[PDB]
Each structure stands twice: as C-alpha cells, then as structure tokens.
Amino acid sequence: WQARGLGTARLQLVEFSAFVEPPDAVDSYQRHLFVHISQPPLESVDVRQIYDKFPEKKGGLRELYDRGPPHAFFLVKFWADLNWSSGGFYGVSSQYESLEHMTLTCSSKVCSFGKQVVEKVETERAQLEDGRFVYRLLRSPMCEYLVNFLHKLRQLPERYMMNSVLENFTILQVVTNRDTQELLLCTAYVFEVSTSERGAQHHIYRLVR
Amino acid sequence: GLGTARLQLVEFSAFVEPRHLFVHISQPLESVDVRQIYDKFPEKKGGLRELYDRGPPHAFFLVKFWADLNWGPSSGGFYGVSSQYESLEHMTLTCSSKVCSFGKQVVEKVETERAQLEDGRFVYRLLRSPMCEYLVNFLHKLRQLPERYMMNSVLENFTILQVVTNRDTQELLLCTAYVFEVSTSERGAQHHIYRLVR
Ligand SMILES: CCOC(=O)c1cn(CCCCN)nc1-c1ccc(Cl)c(Cl)c1
Ligand SMILES: CCCCCCCCCCCCCC(=O)O
Ligand SMILES: *C(=O)CCCCCCCCCCCCC
C-alpha cells in the first residue's frame, strides 16, 4: 500500500536537518534550525508539475522517475527559518534506517532555475543496532556556496523577495544502493521562508504520475 | 611516479562501456609552481592553497591529461571511474574528488576504501564507481563540438582535485590536481605527471 512518512519498506528517513551553531556555542550551546524533519496516507502531487524545477537529462526527475521505483519518490515543501553576523558552523545531518545491510550513496543536487549548480555525493555503510541498520551522515559541513546564499537571502529587505528568489531554488536528493545501483529514495525539496516568529515547518507529499 | 612512500597510485581510468578509455594511468618528475594553479581550484576551505599550507608538500601532484573523446560508430552506455592505490601499511582511505568549473566546486564525491591484503601488500580498489551525472552530460555535450580547439577552450575552465587521506588519522596521503585537453584519437590518450612545489 501507500506511504505514511518519508520512506519505503527498504529505507526510511529518520531525521534530516540543516543548522548553524554560533561561534559561542562552545560556551553556551545552541543551534538554529533552518529546516528540520524528524520521523493516514500522505497527500500526493503530480511529478510532471515540478520537472522544470530540476535538471532534465541524466539524473533529472523525469529520467529518475522512469527508472523507478515510483513509490520511492517524495516532495518536501519547507518553510525555512532564516532569522538567526557570521563565522559559525553550518551543517547538515541525515539519518536513515533499513532492515537490510547496504552501503548507500547519497547525492544532494542544489539547483538554480532547474540547473544543477552544486552537488555532494557521500557513501555510508550500515551500522547494526537494535534489530535494524542505521546510516548516519551527521554534521556534514554545508557547502560554502549554500552558506553564502543563505547570508544573502537573509539580508533581502522583504519576505516576498526571499520567496521570489526561493521560487527558483531547489534540492534533489537521491539515495541508492551503492552495490546494486537501485534507487532507494528520491526527495525533491522546494522552499519558502517562514514568517520570523514561526520557526521551520514542512509538508511531505508522495510524488505520483 | 604518482605516489609517496605511504601510498602509490597503481591505476586510474575513466571510461565508457556499451570499453573506451577517456584517460588512463597505468603504473624524476618535473616540478610546477602550485601558485600557478591556485586560480584553477576554489580559494575556500578545501582550497589548494590551504591544503598545501598544511602539507606535507611531497604529497601534492599535478596530472595533465590529453583525453580521447572519440568513441561511437552514440547514447547510453556505462560511464565509470576505476582507481587503484597501494601501500605497505594497513589503512582505510577517504577519497575526495572535487569537480571544478571556473575554479568553483560544482561536484564533491566522497568514497571510502579499506585495505585488502594481496601479494604481500595492501591494495585499495575503487573500481567502476559510476561517473556522476554532471560529468556524463558535460561529456555528451563536449563531444558534439566540431573542433578540438573548441573542446580545449571549454576544458581550460574544467578541473578536478582529488584528496586522499588516512581516514583514521585525518592525514593527507595524496592530493592530485588534474587539468585537461583533448587528443586526436590518432595520437591517443596521454598524461604527464608533475610535482607541485612552493
Ligand atoms: C555565487 C554567485 O551566484 C551564483 O553563482 C549564481 C548565479 N545563479 C543564477 C542561476 C543560473 C544557473 N547557472 N544562481 C547562483 C547560485 C544560487 C544558489 C547557489 Cl547555492 C549557488 Cl552555488 C549559486
Ligand atoms: C575530459 C574528461 C575526461 C573524463 C574525466 C574523468 C575524471 C573524473 C574523475 C572522477 C571524479 C568524479 C566522478 C563522479 O563523481 O562522477
Ligand atoms: C553542500 O554540501 C550540499 C549540501 C546538501 C544538503 C543541503 C540541505 C540544505 C537545507 C535547506 C537550506 C535552506 C534554504 C532556504
């Protein structure tokens, strides 16, 4: 049947976050969450509606959705919290869970007007824990181009301009079994800014066709 | 050639199968002022300047490739990178490949490889790693160009930086900067390995 959270039977997202720790977190620890996911069917969105927002060739949404499997595809809409003037640590943390032991390859493609501008590919081997395997990609340093982007977005004089800019900014994550090259999870991320007093939020959708 | 006492490159190839080799290394060198190539890689953290500043200086090499983009009778096919290192000490390696366009990093690929004992040494085989899609698309375009001089013009802004570290100790074992031109298929692929100095 049909997904309740961001995951399949073979690979579930446990946690995802992007954050910054101010220079003085060493003395009084804190972190600011730009976005955060911590884990009745999910609503769906037709994948044709977003093809233009990601690349369109090899490793593009259309071609990935063709390779399948269709149930592995999700869309997350984030309301990002950009209220937090620099020199801190900017990080991304990811955690997944499976019942089988695999080695994963996680690709994150940052895209501007649907054109890939950066990419990070990491591999992570399973860790056998409580009747299940865990995959930890914790505290990856954020790419500096993304840090710069955030610094710029945050200075825009109006929220509506932040949203206009973000209209053309997306992230595609594809997780595959490094050994078989099977797709395990594909997540498209689209962004708005949250309104200051509200922190980060998200809504997860299944991508259908 | 491309090596220290702790770690040597044995083979490196990038290729496509339906095997065509775009580049290939199978295993004193001239020296190049690393200063000359700072502008070919980002000045950020993981910048060639900053990596070199730490050292050790004898771990840094430059490879110039004259690539062979003459394949086909052509779309699809498997695009891969195979590398092999070797050593006398037992290690686990973190292999970072950074693809750069006009000095800015556009891809970082991180892989891990554990030593395996063979013929009385340790070998590290990162074989048939799927070439990232950025590069595959890039190569598909690059090959359409009607003249080599045009391929060369495009390639003067395209570089790769590979950093290989001892995962457990975080020590730099090898750092290689790659620059690119195209060869004629008559002449075939070629490379020239240099040492980077400062
Ligand atoms: C650093 C100065 O600005 C740029 O390089 C830049 C220019 N464009 C226009 C989009 C056309 C697609 N090539 N987008 C970006 C950009 C946006 C977000 C990120 Cl996170 C990054 Cl890395 C780059
Ligand atoms: C002119 C291009 C010839 C082929 C280039 C091969 C060298 C690329 C090294 C591979 C590093 C990144 C691989 C990937 O992540 O896709
Ligand atoms: C660079 O290292 C690639 C990192 C890929 C993960 C990026 C996740 C970014 C989180 C959203 C930032 C908020 C933008 C408004």
From Swiss-Prot, chain B:
Compartments reported by the entry: Nucleus
Gene name tied to this protein: TEAD2
UniProt name for this protein: Transcriptional enhancer factor TEF-4
Region described as Transcriptional activation: 1-198
Species per Swiss-Prot/TrEMBL record: Homo sapiens
Role according to the record: Transcription factor which plays a key role in the Hippo signaling pathway, a pathway involved in organ size control and tumor suppression by restricting proliferation and promoting apoptosis. The core of this pathway is composed of a kinase cascade wherein MST1/MST2, in complex with its regulatory protein SAV1, phosphorylates and activates LATS1/2 in complex with its regulatory protein MOB1, which in turn phosphorylates and inactivates YAP1 oncoprotein and WWTR1/TAZ.
Subunit structure: Interacts with YAP1 and WWTR1/TAZ.
